[PDB]
Every structure is written in structure tokens, then in C-alpha cells.
Design a protein around this ligand. Sequence first.
Ligand SMILES: CCn1c(-c2cc(N3CCN(C)CC3)cnc2[C@H](C)OC)c2c3cc(ccc31)-c1csc(n1)C[C@H](NC(=O)[C@H]1C[C@@H]1C)C(=O)N1CCC[C@H](N1)C(=O)OCC(C)(C)C2
Ligand SMILES: Nc1nc2c(ncn2[C@@H]2O[C@H](COP(=O)(O)OP(=O)(O)NP(=O)(O)O)[C@@H](O)[C@H]2O)c(=O)[nH]1
Ligand SMILES: [Mg+2]
Lengths: 164, 170
Amino acid sequence: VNPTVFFDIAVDGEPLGRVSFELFADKVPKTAENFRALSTGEKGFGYKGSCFHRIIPGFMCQGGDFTRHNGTGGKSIYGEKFEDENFILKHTGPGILSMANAGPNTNGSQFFICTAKTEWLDGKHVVFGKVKEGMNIVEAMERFGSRNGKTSKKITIADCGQLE
Amino acid sequence: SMTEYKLVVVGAGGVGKSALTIQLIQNHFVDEYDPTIEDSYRKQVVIDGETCLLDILDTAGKEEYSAMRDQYMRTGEGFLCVFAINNSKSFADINLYREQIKRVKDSDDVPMVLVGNKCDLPTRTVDTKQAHELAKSYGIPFIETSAKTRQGVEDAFYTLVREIRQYRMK
Ligand SMILES: CCn1c(-c2cc(N3CCN(C)CC3)cnc2[C@H](C)OC)c2c3cc(ccc31)-c1csc(n1)C[C@H](NC(=O)[C@H]1C[C@@H]1C)C(=O)N1CCC[C@H](N1)C(=O)OCC(C)(C)C2
Ligand SMILES: Nc1nc2c(ncn2[C@@H]2O[C@H](COP(=O)(O)OP(=O)(O)NP(=O)(O)O)[C@@H](O)[C@H]2O)c(=O)[nH]1
Ligand SMILES: [Mg+2]
């Protein structure tokens, strides 16, 4: 059954709120497992302490670079990169959780949370989850973004883990 | 009060638009790849003895977002059209950028410079003789550059400024 994970988001170190996500292991098991394990930290590395480096209001919040903390890094539990598992799931609206990448078959750890329907990303980014609780937290995160994505405060995953 | 010039750097993904701009602005060569969303920089320089203020827009090389280029093409005063000498598709793409600029600005003689980047590389795929011929067909300069070694970087930007200056003196 599909795992649920959470992030506790902070703004310059001050708690903002919790976002939880259902991970669609029933459709993208390999991609869901990567995000689940990175959320628990059980491999010895993962999302805890990392930041949302790119927030563009009207589109998405992107994060997951826990290796370089500059928007260029990240790694998967399978190695540096892994293949696009499938494109069964689509970018249908706010709350969609999907993999960032540098072209075909370059998934690592970077991900994005949609704040709107981004259907032109279908077939380029592997969708693998959706916000359950705390969409209002994701909406609140947009005030810290900008047109090119540069954030005006440090938006971090202060804690993260698995709930179900 | 100094004369201002709005420059826009365009071209296919990965050709070195940001590497060229960052060389001019920050005096270093970005080895890593960090694909651009959109960035703006300001710098004062002296060209042929006249001080001027460059506003430089560094754009994304993402063909799926071509419709988003119109707005910055309307605002821009001169365009660096960049290809890479090891990327034949990027040289083919130049024609599309030139025609989009001409269409969006409704103007036959927008200030432009054709830039062939990555000339430090030990091999290549683009015949630069074709670049000279293309630039001639457009009536614009062709400049070879390497953002890695800084060769030609100042020349590319300053040449575009000279093209804008000549346009304003028409
Ligand atoms: C034209 C201006 N522009 C725009 C854009 C597009 C529109 N449209 C309006 C009309 N509709 C129908 C179409 C779209 C409007 N306004 C803008 C922006 C606000 O104008 C400044 C985008 C964009 C993306 C890139 C470059 C320029 C770009 C880019 C550059 S690297 C990239 N994408 C993909 C990115 N890889 C990485 O980070 C790699 C480095 C790591 C490992 C990636 O996996 N993800 C996840 C998915 C989202 C994507 N990042 C991203 O940030 O998308 C931004 C977005 C705003 C959604 C699209
Ligand atoms: N050898 C060499 N590599 C270069 C040169 N210019 C850029 N590169 C390299 O090519 C890659 C892409 O460069 P970058 O400037 O990011 O390209 P871009 O045109 O801005 N890409 P985008 O459209 O996605 O923003 C980087 O790894 C960079 O170091 C050059 O003159 N020589
Ligand atoms: Mg760039």
C-alpha cells in the first residue's frame, strides 16, 4: 500500500507547517521508494535540512538538492541517476509531486510540488505523488519565491519522515 | 545619466549563454551546468572611450517555451545570438531566433551579433565558414568566443553595443 511521508517546512529556521504526501508506489514503485527512503533518511542521507531553492509563484516549488545545496546536486538511493520509470501519472493540478531532471533518465533526488496545473511537463517529468495534508503550507511558500525562482527567505525541510 | 543599452543573450540550450555573461559580469568560468530560468545583470563599462550602462538579460535555451521569448524580444535593444561549435543543431537554430526577433519587433535591422562559442574545444561539428556566410546574409557581425578561456567575450558584447550605437545614429 502507498506510503505517506511528511516534510516540516521552516522559514529562516522558524516553523511554518507540515506538508504530507501520498506516494503512488502502486504505479511508480521505484520512484516512490526513492522519495520515501530519502524522506526517512534511512540510507544515511536525504532531504532533512535541505532547502527549496526555486519557488516560482503560479507554477511550483522545487527542492531536493541535499548534496550541493545550490540547485545542481542531489542523488538517488540507486546511485547518481536513475531512469524515467513511466509516465502513467500526469501534472493535473495543484499538489502534484514530480521529479526534476536534466533530460531523459536523469532522476536523482530533486523534485517539485505543483501549485497549478502544469500539463506541458507531462512526458518529461515522472509524477509519483500528491499532497495530502498541508496544501495551505505549499501555497504559503509562494510568497517567498519570485519570477525566476530565487527565494527571499531560506525555506527548508526542518524535519521529514514517514507516516504510513 | 550615462547611455544605457538593453542586451539580450539568446540561443539553444547549453551553448554557453550564461558562461559568456558570467565571464563578463563575475570574471570566472562556470564549469557546472545550471540551466537558466532568466537572469538580469547590470554593469558599467567604457567602450571606445564612452562610458555606458549595460543591462544584460540571460535567457533560457528551451524551445518548448518559444512563445515566452516575444516579451523580452520587444523590450531588448540588441541581441547576442549564440551557437556552440560542437552543436550543429544550435547553429541551425540561429535562423529561428533571427526570424522571431524580426517578426516580434516588426523590424528588418534589429542590432544583432552572431556568436560562435566554445572555440577552446579540441574537436567541433560546425563549419564556421557557414557562420560567416549566415552573418553576411543578415548584415551582422560574427564573433568567435570561448567562455572557458575568456577569448572574445568582451569583443562579443562590445560589438553588439557598437551595433546599437550605429542604429541610433542612422
Ligand atoms: C521561459 C521562462 N521559463 C518558464 C516559464 C514558462 C511559462 N509558461 C506560460 C505558458 N504555459 C502554457 C507554458 C509555460 C511562463 N513563465 C515562465 C517563467 C516564470 O518566466 C520566467 C519555465 C521555465 C523553465 C526553465 C527555464 C525557463 C522557463 C527550465 C530551466 S531548467 C528546467 N526548466 C527544468 C528543471 N531542471 C532542473 O532544475 C535541473 C537542474 C536540476 C537537476 C526541472 O526539472 N524543473 C521541474 C519542473 C519545473 C521546472 N524545473 C521549472 O522551474 O519550470 C519553471 C516554469 C515556470 C514552470 C516554466
Ligand atoms: N569548453 C567550453 N565549455 C563551455 C563554454 N561555455 C559554456 N561551457 C559549458 O557548457 C555547459 C553549459 O553552459 P551554460 O553557460 O550553462 O549554457 P547556457 O546556454 O546558459 N544553457 P541554458 O540555456 O540551459 O541556460 C556548462 O558545463 C559550461 O561550463 C565554452 O566556451 N567552452
Ligand atoms: Mg544559461
